[PDB]
Design a protein around this ligand. Structure first.
Ligand SMILES: OC[C@H]1O[C@H](O[C@H]2[C@@H](O)[C@H](O)[C@@H](CO)O[C@@H]2O)[C@@H](O)[C@@H](O)[C@@H]1O
Ligand SMILES: OC[C@H]1O[C@H](O[C@H]2[C@@H](O)[C@H](O)[C@@H](CO)O[C@@H]2O)[C@@H](O)[C@@H](O)[C@@H]1O
Ligand SMILES: OC[C@H]1O[C@H](O[C@H]2[C@@H](O)[C@H](O)[C@@H](CO)O[C@@H]2O)[C@@H](O)[C@@H](O)[C@@H]1O
Ligand SMILES: [K+]
Ligand SMILES: [K+]
Ligand SMILES: [K+]
Length: 112
């Protein structure tokens, strides 16, 4: 289902172009996500895998088995990219990107 930023209240969102962003909850399936158990976080509408790189950019692409598309969900709300180690982040404008863990609330996420 949904992934909601702890700082901004905006939810994790993505489209068929593979662009990612956050928006207020709006019921659409672009805002729900599925975790099979293989490390991936797949968009409920598109089936694509949330993914990022060493530059900090974050997008979705069809799923390819790479550590890049594998995420770790900690109980403190961090969502960590296995390859880079950088943590999923966003800003009130609805930018999504990754940055070094810095303890910030913009790096926390309620996932249900
Ligand atoms: O009208 C389409 C779409 O609008 C809203 O979706 C937005 C966003 O959440 C989706 O990620 C993108 C996908 O390109 O479209 C909008 O910006 C929701 O109402 C959604 O359910 C709906 O189909
Ligand atoms: O060979 C690099 C990388 O390729 C594939 O991952 C794609 C994408 O998911 C990644 O975010 C970017 C990283 O720059 O790379 C591709 O576009 C996977 O085959 C992956 O295992 C591999 O490391
Ligand atoms: O000092 C602002 C901000 O800095 C640190 O957060 C960084 C990053 O995680 C955020 O997404 C962006 C949002 O604009 O800001 C920094 O780049 C954190 O220490 C944070 O608590 C603080 O508000
Ligand atoms: K779209
Ligand atoms: K900090
Ligand atoms: K602050």
């Amino acid at each position: 289902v949904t992934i909601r930023n702890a700082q901004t209240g905006r939810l994790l969102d993505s489209n068929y172009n593979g662009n990612v962003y956050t928006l207020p909850a709006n019921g659409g399936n672009y805002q729900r996500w599925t975790g099979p158990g293989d490390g991936t976080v797949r968009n409920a509408q598109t089936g694509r895998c949330l993914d990022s790189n060493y530059d900090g950019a974050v997008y979705t692409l069809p799923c390819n088995g790479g550590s890049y598309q594998k995420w770790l969900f900690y109980s403190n709300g961090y969502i960590q990219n296995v390859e880079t180690g950088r943590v999923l982040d966003s800003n009130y404008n609805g930018n999504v990107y990754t940055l070094p863990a810095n303890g910030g609330n913009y790096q926390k996420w309620y996932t249900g």
